[PDB]
Amino acid sequence: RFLKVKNWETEVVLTDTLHLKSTLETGCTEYICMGSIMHPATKDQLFPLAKEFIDQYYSSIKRFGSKAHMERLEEVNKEIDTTSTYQLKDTELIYGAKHAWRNASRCVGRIQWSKLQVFDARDCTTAHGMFNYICNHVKYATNKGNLRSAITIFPQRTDGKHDFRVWNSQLIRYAGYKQPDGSTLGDPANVQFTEICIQQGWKPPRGRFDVLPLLLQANGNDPELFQIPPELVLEVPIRHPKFEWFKDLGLKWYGLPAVSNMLLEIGGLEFSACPFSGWYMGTEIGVRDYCDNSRYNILEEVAKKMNLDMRKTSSLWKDQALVEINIAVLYSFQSDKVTIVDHHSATESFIKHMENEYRCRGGCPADWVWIVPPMSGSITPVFHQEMLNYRLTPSFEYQPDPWNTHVW
Amino acid sequence: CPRFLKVKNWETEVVLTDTLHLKSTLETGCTEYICMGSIMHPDVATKDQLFPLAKEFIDQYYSSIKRFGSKAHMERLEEVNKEIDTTSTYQLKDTELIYGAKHAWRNASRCVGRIQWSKLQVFDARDCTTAHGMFNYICNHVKYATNKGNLRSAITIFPQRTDGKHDFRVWNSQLIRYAGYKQPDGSTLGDPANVQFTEICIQQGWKPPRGRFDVLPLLLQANGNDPELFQIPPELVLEVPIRHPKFEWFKDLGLKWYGLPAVSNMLLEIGGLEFSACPFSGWYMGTEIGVRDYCDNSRYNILEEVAKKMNLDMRKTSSLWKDQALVEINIAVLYSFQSDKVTIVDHHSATESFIKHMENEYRCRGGCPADWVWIVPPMSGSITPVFHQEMLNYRLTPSFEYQPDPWNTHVWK
Ligand code: HEM
Ligand code: HEM
Ligand SMILES: CN(C)c1ccc(CCNCc2ccc3ccc(N)nc3c2)cc1
Ligand SMILES: CN(C)c1ccc(CCNCc2ccc3ccc(N)nc3c2)cc1
Ligand SMILES: C[C@H](O)[C@H](O)[C@H]1CNc2nc(N)[nH]c(=O)c2N1
Ligand SMILES: C[C@H](O)[C@H](O)[C@H]1CNc2nc(N)[nH]c(=O)c2N1
Numbered sequence: 001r002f003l004k005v006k007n008w009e010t011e012v013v014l015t016d017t018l019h020l021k022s023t024l025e026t027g028c029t030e031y032i033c034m035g036s037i038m039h040p041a042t043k044d045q046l047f048p049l050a051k052e053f054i055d056q057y058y059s060s061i062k063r064f065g066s067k068a069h070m071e072r073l074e075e076v077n078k079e080i081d082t083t084s085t086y087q088l089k090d091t092e093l094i095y096g097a098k099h100a101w102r103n104a105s106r107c108v109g110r111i112q113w114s115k116l117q118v119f120d121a122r123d124c125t126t127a128h129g130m131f132n133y134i135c136n137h138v139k140y141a142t143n144k145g146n147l148r149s150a151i152t153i154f155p156q157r158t159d160g161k162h163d164f165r166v167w168n169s170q171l172i173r174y175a176g177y178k179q180p181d182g183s184t185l186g187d188p189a190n191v192q193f194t195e196i197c198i199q200q201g202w203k204p205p206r207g208r209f210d211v212l213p214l215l216l217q218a219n220g221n222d223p224e225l226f227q228i229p230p231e232l233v234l235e236v237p238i239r240h241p242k243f244e245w246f247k248d249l250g251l252k253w254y255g256l257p258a259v260s261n262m263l264l265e266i267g268g269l270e271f272s273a274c275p276f277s278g279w280y281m282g283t284e285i286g287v288r289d290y291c292d293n294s295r296y297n298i299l300e301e302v303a304k305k306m307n308l309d310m311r312k313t314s315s316l317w318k319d320q321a322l323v324e325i326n327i328a329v330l331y332s333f334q335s336d337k338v339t340i341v342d343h344h345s346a347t348e349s350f351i352k353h354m355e356n357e358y359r360c361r362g363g364c365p366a367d368w369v370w371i372v373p374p375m376s377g378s379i380t381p382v383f384h385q386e387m388l389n390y391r392l393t394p395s396f397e398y399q400p401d402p403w404n405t406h407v408w
Numbered sequence: 409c410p411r412f413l414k415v416k417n418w419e420t421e422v423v424l425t426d427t428l429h430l431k432s433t434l435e436t437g438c439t440e441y442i443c444m445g446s447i448m449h450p451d452v453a454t455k456d457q458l459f460p461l462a463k464e465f466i467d468q469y470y471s472s473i474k475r476f477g478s479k480a481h482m483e484r485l486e487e488v489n490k491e492i493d494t495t496s497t498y499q500l501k502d503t504e505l506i507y508g509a510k511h512a513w514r515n516a517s518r519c520v521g522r523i524q525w526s527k528l529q530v531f532d533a534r535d536c537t538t539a540h541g542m543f544n545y546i547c548n549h550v551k552y553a554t555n556k557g558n559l560r561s562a563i564t565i566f567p568q569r570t571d572g573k574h575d576f577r578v579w580n581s582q583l584i585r586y587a588g589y590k591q592p593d594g595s596t597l598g599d600p601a602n603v604q605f606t607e608i609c610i611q612q613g614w615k616p617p618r619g620r621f622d623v624l625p626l627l628l629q630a631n632g633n634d635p636e637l638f639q640i641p642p643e644l645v646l647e648v649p650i651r652h653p654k655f656e657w658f659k660d661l662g663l664k665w666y667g668l669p670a671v672s673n674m675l676l677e678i679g680g681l682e683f684s685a686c687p688f689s690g691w692y693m694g695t696e697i698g699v700r701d702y703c704d705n706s707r708y709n710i711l712e713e714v715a716k717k718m719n720l721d722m723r724k725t726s727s728l729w730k731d732q733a734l735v736e737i738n739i740a741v742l743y744s745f746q747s748d749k750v751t752i753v754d755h756h757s758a759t760e761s762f763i764k765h766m767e768n769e770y771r772c773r774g775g776c777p778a779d780w781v782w783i784v785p786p787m788s789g790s791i792t793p794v795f796h797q798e799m800l801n802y803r804l805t806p807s808f809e810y811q812p813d814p815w816n817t818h819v820w821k
């Protein structure tokens with residue numbers, strides 16, 4: 001059946017047919033919703049996935065059933081038949097990557113989906129090569145502050161024994177350190193990976209914002225350590241437009257958000273290493289990285305300098321300190337000519353994107369739990385937007401951290 | 409289905425295991441290939457249909473009270489059965505009904521205040537026959553629940569649906585709400601939410617004051633007759649003028665709200681029986697008023713005005729002038745209710761208490777259905793503990809259900 005979604009502030013109702021195209025399971029059943037749960041090949045398996053992907057490729061370019069289509073199908077079959085896998089054409093790789101982004105139910109920045117610089121790194125064979133490709137990515141994507149969306153794609157998985165993996169969760173992330181007293185210096189989310197790096201020979205400065213090094217694994221081999229040239233790492237000192245004491249807090253963050261731990265699945269093929277990068281929505285930094293209890297956890301300190309009444313929770317002193325911090329972040333990146341979107345602008349763009357997608361594509365999978373920003377929820381349009389969620393392919397999936405499987 | 413489902417809290421790392429979901433009764437709207445978790449909403453029963461529903465419930469009751477398989481249990485089954493054979497329905501004892509109402513609350517996956525579920529004063533109004541009697545019962549509800557501002561949760565239960573042609577209904581969505589009036593210029597006065605019901609009221613003969621906070625009259629249907637209008641005694645309606653602990657100008661906004669949230673349009677389903685008029689009340693979470701009632705664009709929509717008075721730069725959105733005003737408004741709401749000693753809970757306290765509730769439910773009950781989309785407060789989500797808490801959502805019965813608005817279905821006499 002067709003399904004309607006309503007926006008309760010504007011009363012707009014879109015009709016969803018696209019959901020009928022999916023085959024992967026969301027996790028829910030008719031009796032149990034898991035919408036707030038974070039995580040709910042052979043030749044025989046490989047061809048239909050290949051065939052479905054090529055079919056939608058040639059359908060997207062309005063040449064379905066054509067000679068090129070037929071031959072390509074024959075070509076891919078004849079290759080899986082004799083190699084137990086197949087290689088994507090350059091065209092398919094780019095279409096595939098942009099469509100994985102287009103299909104990411106959790107991404108509020110999808111209005112940018114078709115503007116994506118794809119770097120083919122399928123000829124890479126070593127970690128040194130990986131470091132080269134990654135360094136080129138960062139310099140390109142950063143672009144002196146005028147960030148650009150990029151993705152660098154390393155060889156697809158073969159037997160599982162020879163995966164390319166980027167061990168860092170993001171190409172640029174700060175170190176975290178378990179102190180003697182049991183506290184954490186720096187970013188607590190990275191304490192494990194920070195220790196693995198040190199175990200491998202990395203000499204840590206042991207400060208609050210130390211850039212982690214790259215840990216790259218090629219062809220299933222032991223991973224290797226590489227320092228990103230500091231000139232390639234754009235960072236922003238966080239200050240406040242009215243509060244001149246905010247710089248005293250000693251806050252900074254990096255400009256490039258570049259996720260490196262995911263798995264890009266195309267046409268039945270698995271790219272275990274596909275670090276991609278966009279730009280920030282301020283709350284990522286302002287709300288989550290800085291204020292989460294398990295993260296930098298600065299709320300109390302900020303509210304102290306704000307001299308707020310902190311005895312009872314009903315002074316909303318946390319809510320006060322929160323808005324001010326996120327103002328600082330947006331003010332800093334802007335003042336430094338580094339690309340950054342606030343959550344009002346971002347969510348609006350997403351609504352506008354949704355309407356585009358419904359009109360041209362008959363739907364748009366969207367994960368309300370993730371789309372709604374972690375602050376000021378209902379004063380953004382997305383809060384009032386009914387969304388449907390389903391899994392379309394190609395896509396970005398999660399994968400085991402490498403240090404749980406890899407044998408040295 | 410899997411018999412053991414795990415949920416994690418990513419802030420504390422606590423994992424809980426859910427087994428209660430196995431006793432799920434109705435469809436959620438979701439399937440294996442699609443999730444409807446952000447969808448707001450995704451002629452009677454018969455003899456053969458009612459037996460399993462009643463027995464299911466009765467078994468559950470005698471289970472709670474540790475008398476399962478007893479003489480009293482088996483006799484109650486025999487009595488309910490015979491009643492359904494001979495009258496096509498059955499009547500709940502006063503104990504079964506109270507249990508039932510408390511558990512519909514306990515089962516409410518969308519409700520962040522369920523830690524209070526066991527403290528619910530239940531008024532049995534099954535002897536009601538007229539609209540005037542409904543109004544009597546409803547006035548008594550309000551006075552007791554209000555309690556001079558030290559509010560107490562309560563429910564009044566009217567006779568159950570029988571053949572569908574004699575339903576009791578409260579046409580109000582809440583017993584206390586403000587009128588909305590559509591002007592010929594397109595602008596609305598009062599509360600945009602209640603414009604349709606306000607119009608219905610004027611049709612039925614209400615002479616509206618036509619102001620910004622005018623308490624709606626009650627529209628009451630008993631036994632399937634046409635509804636009748638009654639004015640709630642003003643002395644029974646506790647209100648709070650909204651002011652700010654720091655901004656003197658905030659009182660000049662002329663803002664007030666009522667103390668008692670009193671939802672009156674849900675259906676209460678217990679053991680296959682349908683109580684189409686079951687007004688219930690609790691007390692407010694601050695955000696309901698400060699964020700939703702006040703700042704929603706389709707509602708009172710005061711953000712711009714509050715921002716103007718805060719002298720905020722409102723050209724660009726990245727100044728966060730909206731977020732700045734929203735917090736202040738919510739501080740004022742909380743500050744006012746507390747100053748007038750009217751019970752109210754901030755979103756930090758409530759979400760925090762619900763986590764404790766949820767954990768205890770997993771412990772003593774094997775689970776606790778919850779709607780993350782609804783539980784997480786509409787402001788500062790990630791800085792409350794429920795944002796980080798994985799929840800499973802599913803429908804247990806007894807339950808509060810939605811039902812069509814009565815003017816859509818009522819055959820006028
Ligand atoms: C261009 C500007 C972009 C913006 C403003 C943006 C915004 C966001 C935000 C705010 C999230 C929430 C993630 C979190 O809270 O941890 C997200 C998630 C996500 N984004 Fe985008 N993004 C952008 C670019 C991209 C690109 C270039 C890709 C891939 C090619 C992408 C794919 C994804 C995926 C797969 C997720 C899911 C995250 C997860 O599963 O953990 N985004 N995005
Ligand atoms: C005692 C204090 C209570 C608090 C703080 C509380 C809190 C809340 C809040 C904040 C909501 C969201 C409402 C909305 O966003 O529109 C809600 C929903 C709900 N509550 Fe509670 N609640 C309380 C009492 C009760 C009681 C006494 C009952 C019934 C006996 C109840 C049953 C429900 C139900 C069925 C919903 C779903 C609302 C809907 O579907 O529209 N609650 N609660
Ligand atoms: C494994 N777990 C629990 C877990 C998995 C993913 C996350 C979120 C990681 N994704 C962050 C992320 C991913 C892609 C992005 C794209 C653009 C952007 N501005 N931020 C972005 C941020 C958190 C926890
Ligand atoms: C028909 N639609 C679109 C619609 C349905 C329900 C809602 C939410 C109404 N729920 C209100 C409600 C219900 C129970 C409550 C219990 C306690 C409390 N403080 N507020 C409470 C508030 C909004 C729109
Ligand atoms: C339990 C819940 O699913 C988890 O906390 C989610 C909630 N929504 C989120 N939304 C975004 N954008 N990012 C997140 O990490 C999360 N975390
Ligand atoms: C579209 C979305 O499902 C809708 O706006 C919901 C979201 N969560 C909510 N949560 C609460 N508590 N109350 C609401 O009215 C809503 N509205």
Ligand SMILES: [Zn+2]
Pocket residue numbers: 028032033034035438442443444445
């Ligand atoms: Zn679901």
